[PDB]
Structure formats: C-alpha cells, structure tokens
Amino acid sequence: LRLLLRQREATDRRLSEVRKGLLINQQSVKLRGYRPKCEKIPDKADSLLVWEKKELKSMKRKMEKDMEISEDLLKALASCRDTLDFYCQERLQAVELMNQ
Amino acid sequence: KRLLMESKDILTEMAKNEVDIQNQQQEISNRVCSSLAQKMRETLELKERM
Amino acid sequence: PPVKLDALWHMPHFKKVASHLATFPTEADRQRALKAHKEEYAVRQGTLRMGNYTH
Amino acid sequence: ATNYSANQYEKAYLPTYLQNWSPARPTKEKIAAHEGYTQIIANDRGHLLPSVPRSKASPWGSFMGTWQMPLKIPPAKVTLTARTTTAADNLTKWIHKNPDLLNACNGLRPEISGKP
Amino acid sequence: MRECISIHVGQAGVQIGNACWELYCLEHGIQPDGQMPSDKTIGGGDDSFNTFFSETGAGKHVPRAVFVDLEPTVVDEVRTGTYRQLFHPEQLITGKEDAANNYARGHYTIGKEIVDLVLDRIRKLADLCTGLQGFLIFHSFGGGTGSGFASLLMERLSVDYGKKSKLEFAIYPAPQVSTAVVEPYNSILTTHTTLEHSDCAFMVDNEAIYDICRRNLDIERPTYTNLNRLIGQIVSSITASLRFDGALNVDLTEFQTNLVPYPRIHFPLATYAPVISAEKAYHEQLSVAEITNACFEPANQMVKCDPRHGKYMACCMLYRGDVVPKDVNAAIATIKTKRTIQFVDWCPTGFKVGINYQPPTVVPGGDLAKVQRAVCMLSNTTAIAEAWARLDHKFDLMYAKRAFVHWYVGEGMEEGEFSEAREDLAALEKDYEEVGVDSVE
Amino acid sequence: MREIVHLQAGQCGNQIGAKFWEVISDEHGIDPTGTYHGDSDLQLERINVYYNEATGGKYVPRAVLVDLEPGTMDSVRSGPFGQIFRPDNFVFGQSGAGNNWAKGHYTEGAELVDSVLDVVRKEAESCDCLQGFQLTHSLGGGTGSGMGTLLISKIREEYPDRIMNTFSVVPSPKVSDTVVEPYNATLSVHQLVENTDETYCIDNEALYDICFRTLKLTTPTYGDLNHLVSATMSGVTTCLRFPGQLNADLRKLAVNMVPFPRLHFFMPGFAPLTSRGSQQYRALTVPELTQQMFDAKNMMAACDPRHGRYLTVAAVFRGRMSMKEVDEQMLNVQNKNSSYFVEWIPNNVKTAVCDIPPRGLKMSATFIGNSTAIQELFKRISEQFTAMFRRKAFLHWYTGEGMDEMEFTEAESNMNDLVSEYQQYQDATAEEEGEFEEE
Amino acid sequence: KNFINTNAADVIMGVAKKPKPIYVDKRTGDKHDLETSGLFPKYINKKDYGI
C-alpha cells in the first residue's frame, strides 16, 4: 500500500505535464494566428500542431485510466489491511497476561 | 494473498506506462518543432531571392 | 499513512430521482458534458468529484 | 365597493404610494354610459325579486383563516425558465391543486412566467 | 426611505438581534433610552436612522424589529436588561410553551397560534415604513421554533407580500459539533419548505466561527456574544450602503439579483476581513490587497467547507472605509490571476462590487481592533454541495430505523413528508452537480 | 407559566422529597416560615414554577405527600423545613401495606386514590399552563411501588399530553432489605413501561459506593443519598427556572433523549463530588467536570456502561462558561470511546447550559444517559423473580387480595420483551435497510 | 417479535393527531379556543338560518 501512494503521485505529476503540453500547443496556434494574411495560408506544420493535440488528449486518457485502476486497488488494500488488524486483536486478546 | 498477487503486476505497469508516456510526449514536440523550423528555412530562403 | 477516499453513505431508495433543473440546451450536449465529468473522478479533489485538480 | 380612477391624479392614489405594501384591489379605468332610467330589482328591505338572476358565490365574503388555509402553500413567484418538462408540470399542479385559495380574497394569485 | 424590517425568530434570533441592535444604536448615536444625547430639534436631520428606527412624538426612536420566541425567559431578559426602554412592549412577542427541538410542533401545533399576532405586528411596521426595501429574517435550522415557525411565517409572508425580498440569515448545522441529536430532521424539513419561499441565504455554522475566533482574535475561551458581534458586523456592512453615502452604493435587491443564478440555488457563504486583535493590528499594514487576499483563504470562511472543493459561481464584494477604486481593481486583478481560485465557465465576470465611505464602528467590550478599512464577501459556490451530502448522510442513517419519528407523527405530521423532503434535497444536490458541469463541444 | 406538580409517594418519596424541597428552598431563598429573603432579582422571577402564592408574601410548595401509614408524615412535618408544606396536601391512610404491592395497588390504595386525585386536580387547575408531574417513589416498597403506579395510570389517562417524570428507586440485588422485593419490582416495571414519559433509575447501593469512594465520608447516612438525588432533580429543571446562554428544559430533553417510546430509563449523575484534600488538590474546570461525569464510578445506577452501547447522552451544565470548551470536550469524548456509542445516530449527545450556578458552587454539571447496559438490572430482577415465582412462594399474600395468577406471567412477558428489544437495538447495524423500504 | 420491523410498521401505518384551533391574543402567551369565541362563523352557516 505504501508503495502505491508514491506511484499515485508519480503519475499525477506527469498528468500536469500532459496538461501543460496542451496549453503549450494551443498557445502556439494563437501565435500562428498573428502572422499577416500572406503568411496565413495553411501549411503542413499546421497539421502537425493539430496532430499534437489529438495525442495529448489520448495520452491524457491512458494516465486518467492509470489512476482509476490505481484507486480501486488502493481501497481494497486498505480494507484487507483494516480487517487483518481487527482479526489480530481477537486472538491477541486471550494472551494479554502472556508475553506476546 | 490475492491482493498481493494483484498488486505487483499492477505496480509495474504504472511505472512502465509512466516512462513511455513521458518519452512519447517529448517525441511529439521535437518532430513538431522541427517542421516549424522547416517552414522557417523556406521563408528565409525566399527572402534571399527577394 | 491513512488512505481515506469515499462518499458518505446514502440509502438506495432516494437514488435515481431525476434532477429538477435542466440547463443545457440539448441532451446531446448533456451526455457529452457528463461523460467528460465522469473521467476526471480520480483527479478531482474533495468529495463528489467537484474540486480543483489535485496538484 | 368599486375603486375609481382620479384620472390625472391617479398617481397619488396608487396602492404602494399610499404605503399599502401588499396586493391591493384593482381600479376601474373606463366608465360606460347608460341611456334611460333604471329598473327596480329588489323588494322592500333589499330582497331580490324571483325573476332577477343572482350570483352563486358565497353570501358572506371569502376569508381563509390560519386553521383553514392549506398546509402547503405554493409560492407566488413561478418562473419556469430552466425547469424540466415534468418539473414545470408538477409545480403547476401544486399551483392549481387548491382552487379555494385562488378564489379567496386573502388567497394568493400567482403569476407563471417562462416555459421549460 | 430605505427600510429593512427585522423578523428575528428563536433564541438565536433574539440574541443576534440584541447584538445587532446594540451595534445600530452605538453607530447612530442613540442612547439606551432611545433619545439623542441632547434636546436636539426635529428640524435637524441625520435621518439616516430612518432605515432602522422610526420617530415618535417625543423625538424618540423605536426599532423596526419583532423579536419572536416561544419560551418566556429569553425575551424576559431583554425586557429587564439595559435596553428595556428602547423596545416597544408590543413588539417583543413570546409564547407560553415552546416546540422543544420539534419542527412538527413548531409548524402545525404551536406556531399556528401566534402566526396571526406576529403577522399583524409586521403589518403595522410595514404600514409605518414608506418605501419598504426588505425583510431581514434571522433564525437557526436546529431549534424547533426557529425552524418550524420561521418556515410557516415565511410561507404566509410570501402570500401577504408577493414581491418584497426576504433575506435569510441562518445558523447551519456544524459538520462535527452539535447541540442536538434531532437537528438533522429539522435541517432537512425546513429547507424543503423554504426552497420555494426564499430569496437569498447566508448560512453560517458556529464551528468555523469558533475556529476563526480562536485563531485570529486570540481568545481561547469566548462565548456566543463574541459570535453575535461578528454576525452584527456582517449585517452592518450589508446595510451600510443604505445607511450612509458611498462611492458606489448597493441596495439589497442588487446583491440579491447578482448572486442567484438559478431559482433553486440561493445559498451564498459569507466572509469578513480583517478580524484581528489590537496586539496583532499594531504590527500589520491593513490594505485592500491584504484584506481581499484574506477573504479568499479557505481558513477564513465561516462555513466548514473549502471552496477549493468546488467552483465559485458569483461573488458580491462590499468594501468599507478608507478604500480607493484603483486599488480595488488592482486587488481584483491579482485575485483573477490565480489558478487556485477557479470559476465556472458561464460566469466570465462574476463580481458585484460596492464601496462605502464610513469605517465600521467599534463597540467597547468587543474583540476587534479599530481599523480604517474592511471588506465583506458573499460568494455563491458549489462547494456547499458536500455539506448537503453530509446532511443527507446523517438524515438517512437516522431515518433507516425510523428513529425519533414517533414524536413528529404523534404531534400530527405525516411521515411521507420525510421521504419527500429527503428526495427534494437529493434533487437539489443533483442540481448543484449539473450547474457545476463544464461544457466543451 | 411552566409549572411542575410534585408527587411524593411512600417513605422513600417523603424523605427524598423533603430533602428536595429543602434544596430548592435554599436555592430560591426561602426561610422556614416560607417568605423570601434573597438578595438577587433572578432568585424571585420564576418562583411560580414550583411554588404557589399565599398571603403575607408566602410561598407554599406544589407538592402532594401521599402515604398509607401516619408515622412518616410526623417526621416530615417535624423536620427542619417541615411546616412549609400546606397541611391539606398531606394525604395518609390508617393502615400500611407491609411491603405488599397487591395490597398497595388493589385493596387499600383504592380508597386513598379518590382524595389524592382530588388534590392533584386541585393543584393542576390552580396553574395556568402546567408542564406536568414529577413523582418520587421506590419500587421495593408497598405504597410508592404500589398505589404510586395506580396514581400514574389514572393521571396518564386524565392528562395525556403533559410530561411525567419518575425518580424511581430500583432494587439493588447485591444488598437488599425485603424478601418480596422482586415481586413488587416486576409488577411495577410493567406499569412504568406502559404509562411513563421519563424514568430515572437510582440505586441505593450505588449511592453508598459513591459516598464511600468519592466523598470519603466516615459515616454515610440516608441524608447524603437524598442530597445527591435531590441535586440531580434540581439539575434537571435548573434551565427551566433560570436563564442561560443555550436554554433547554424537560420536554426538550425527552424529545432528544427518547428515540422510541419503550426505552425511557436513564442513568443520572452529578459531576462535582470531592472530599477535603480532593478539593484542595483539584482545580474545578470543564475537562475535569466532563471526565468525572463520564467516569463509571460516578454513575448512580447499578449498570456499568462499558457493558452497553450508549444510545443517547445528555449533559446539562451549570454556571457561566465558554461554549467552545463544552463542545470541544463532548466531541473529544465522542471520538475517543468510539465503540461505546451506537452508530446509527450521529452526535448522540445533547447539551444545555444554565447561567445560575448551584448555591455554594461556581460550576456544576448533570448527566442523563440512556444506554442499553440498563438491561443488566432487568435481567437480574427477572432471574431473582424466576427463582421465587417458580415454586409459588410468598404467593398467598398476593393472591388473597383477589388478583389472578396470569398477571405475573404477563408482567414477566412484557419485561422480557422489553429487554429483547433492547438487545435488538444493541446488536443493530447502521449501513443497512430492509423490510420497510420494500415499497 | 422483530421489533425493528414492528416499530417501523407502527409509525408508517397510522394517522396524524388533528390539532384543535387555538389562537394567542396578547404580547405574552395567552391561548384561547377558537370555535367558541365567536371568531369562527359557526352558527350562521348551520341550522334553519332565516327560517
């Protein structure tokens, strides 16, 4: 369980980088609109900028699903860990005068 | 036992998917920014003959 | 480390009641908006998936 | 009984400017003229004649006290702007559930605005 | 001409009224008799007090308030205290027996006896008032009187006065601390009734004010008086624009209108700044940027819910004192340029700003230091929805076994109303969800 | 305004109500004549709650002292505050019950009941808005356990909606003074569970233990027992008599304290109990008050609540304090001992604060708790009743009065079903609904 | 007896207690019955009125 929380924060830090990348790409297209009308003619590099957006949206998904499977396992780890200690006190309770 | 068996397989994939998705993203930007330079060379080249 | 993340219990009788406020123009917009809503549920904060982004 | 209009002076007699801060009685704006004189429609001591028609409403006014009003009074402000199709129906059914409140003098006369 | 009539209900209503009215008298210069300090001519003015007080024959001032309660002792205290000769005898209305933490008793059995008398008294006060701006109504969601009789008074007030604003200062249940066991039932049943008869609300729970007082005012053991003073300061800053002049004044209807986006979302959350002791005040500059930054701290809201768990939809902002529009705009721009504060999409400009000149007065024996500038804040956000979810949690896990409901049924209320009220709160929560959603197509 | 009529039955009732009236007389400033000689204004503002006006500026208590034997009434009248009571309210028969519940209920209490109903109707019609009746008696006797139940049964019919408290003295099983004690106890608890609003179960053995170990008296007499009980009875309605920051009273306590009508038996307690050196070394504060209130050696019933789930808890505090400390302490004690409160009621604790401290003190507090551990007394009564009623022992005394045999059977059945529903609410789970939400 | 079922069952199946009309008449609590004071119409509607 302890390992999972840091694996949880490791992926979430990358999710900001995916989100930051989506701002970088959209920022660039706004600057690509600043060019004068002679240069405004669309080119191949505009398709590449559109190509970057679709990937980051799709890469957002795999990291989104990365944590959703991380959460459901992480809760099941707690409950088993919870009941395991609960059951430990049951047998430990009749050894209270013993050394244990 | 079951959750321990489930956990170790899950944890590796989170680390494995982490690095690749980190690695893929940097590849997207390098190729994309190269083409913008590729558009720059032609516009600088045409400016010479002008 | 304590790992607490859950919703407070509600009875199943009072579930499935439709909302009294309908704001979006078309159901086509509504379904896409709620589908996008569901996906951030591991990155939203607080409870009911209504917070700001974690980190 | 009736509330006439002071014509050019009706601004002085409007209910809010007389500090009566509540629903108030309507004002008859136009007066029609009758030709000829008038028939007698009542006996001595003000008894209506057998031939003349009579109103069918209550002969003692219409007041609804606290122990007579309904237990769930709907609001006056009904603004069906963002409501769903059924939700506007359900509220409107609540409005029209009790006709005795609407006909009552003390009773509420709600306005309904917009549509789902 | 401006006129707010106070309809304080319950023990909380009466004590909050005591604090607020002492503050108003100290502000306007009234003495505890009800007189100006001298034998001043009625041909003079300073008639600002007309927004709260009313003149009599002898050159005396009578408040436009109706303290109502159903237990004698709380109002006997105000009958006997220092301000005894200030209040008209017929205004303070009491009852012989109280609902005793029972919305059902306070709504169908006991409240319905004193409905008519208090309605007649409010009608006389509204007769006195010339241009009536609104009704301010203070109560609690826990107590039987301040829940049930307040709901019934609201229901009949909507019939008697269709248009007028009915502002709602409410004491919301705290998430952890509680002075009652049955209070989820009251706090569930009153909101279903007042959902369709209400204009704006300012729910405050006492736990957050306890935290604020212990953290900022350096009092480790304060009392309900110290909370009532803060509440009175909030109401003072609300009505300041009516009372005294301002660079940009703002009525009640303005900040009612620009705070409720949809007919079932009328639940702002207050905030006041700064609230700091004299020893701390001797050490800090208090400027507009500082106070507006303190207003948005999630450790300063007097509702125990973090706005960082939701999104703001509207913000009424009320500056007071030695303040300048240029600095106000700079501070709001700095607030805008922050990712930690997130707004909804359909509210690009979500602010309503008002400015007043006169600094807030300081009551001797209070807590706060005297400060030249201050700010009140009224933010409507969807981070309140978690509180409704917690209230539904407690109500459901009590209602499963059908606990305490024999009291209500034996009083004479049907049990299906419990289910109906809980369903409507579920619907309201889903409404909050839908207005919280973003749309990107 | 809000009046209380005080029913007093039996020798137990008479002595403990005598101490009770002495305590309220000293609290409200009343001399042995009956006049008021207090200094503060709040001491005579709501004195009509318990007293009635008589000429000469006199106050007569609203008490009805009922007994089947005249020997107790002489001691009550010749006691210290003896002559304050109006002589007509003394109602007494000429022949005792002999610790016979049947004699007190059917044959001989049937003659005194008419006159005592006349007197309680006198005193109920005197007041304008009466809140209800508070009765004091013991379950191990002949008249309070006996004709007291007849009084309760009749006046519940006559005045339904009014509140009724019963400060019942239950039998301790470890120490006893009567052989036929279980018979009266089991034939009385049935009437209690059928016709009563609130019941406070006080136990003489518990009081003896408290006087032994807490107050450290060399000689604990009955006066200290009655003083403790009367302090509890004063702490219940002090918030009704005096103003506070957060007011409450008896109906508020009942509404927030009784979840279902069958479960209305509470363990009471008083917080500030200390000896000489204890008073020297101990600083009277709010956390110390809460700690000693929740200490189980402080309870005045015969049931440890570490053997039961605290259904609901009430604290009524006395003095001028800060409410933050009160609420923080009660949240602390709720969170710490988590398992000892039932889980299907959040915030099982109800609070009240009254400004006027009890006389001779700067702070105080009173506990009223409903927990399931109170069934420990009914189990013990049922076992000792099984051992007796098995062999039809001592049964001729009861059956000679004219009662049948099925009354014991139905009393035992109802008692057993009461403790059965108590254990059903004991082993109850919260996060579960069924059999009523099938619609 | 499944008391949790029965206690719920007694509550759900039942009727309210109808309260009798009472009105307060003074700035302090003063309860009075309403059906005999003459405020409620009573005799005018019933009986052979006018006959």
Ligand SMILES: Nc1nc2c(ncn2[C@@H]2O[C@H](COP(=O)(O)OP(=O)(O)OP(=O)(O)O)[C@@H](O)[C@H]2O)c(=O)[nH]1
């Ligand atoms: N902030 C604040 N809250 C108060 C005050 N007085 C009471 N309350 C809250 O009100 C809630 C219960 O309602 P109360 O005002 O005490 O009593 P009530 O409104 O008269 O209702 P009843 O007691 O049933 O007659 C409690 O939970 C208190 O926390 C007060 O003076 N200030």
Ligand SMILES: Nc1nc2c(ncn2[C@@H]2O[C@H](COP(=O)(O)OP(=O)(O)O)[C@@H](O)[C@H]2O)c(=O)[nH]1
């Ligand atoms: N706590 C307490 N118990 C008392 C008091 N007086 C009597 N008792 C107990 O009550 C029991 C006897 O009650 P009893 O006189 O038979 O009641 P009666 O027959 O109705 O008068 C004995 O077991 C005593 O221990 C008292 O003043 N205080």
Ligand SMILES: [Mg+2]
């Ligand atoms: Mg109250």
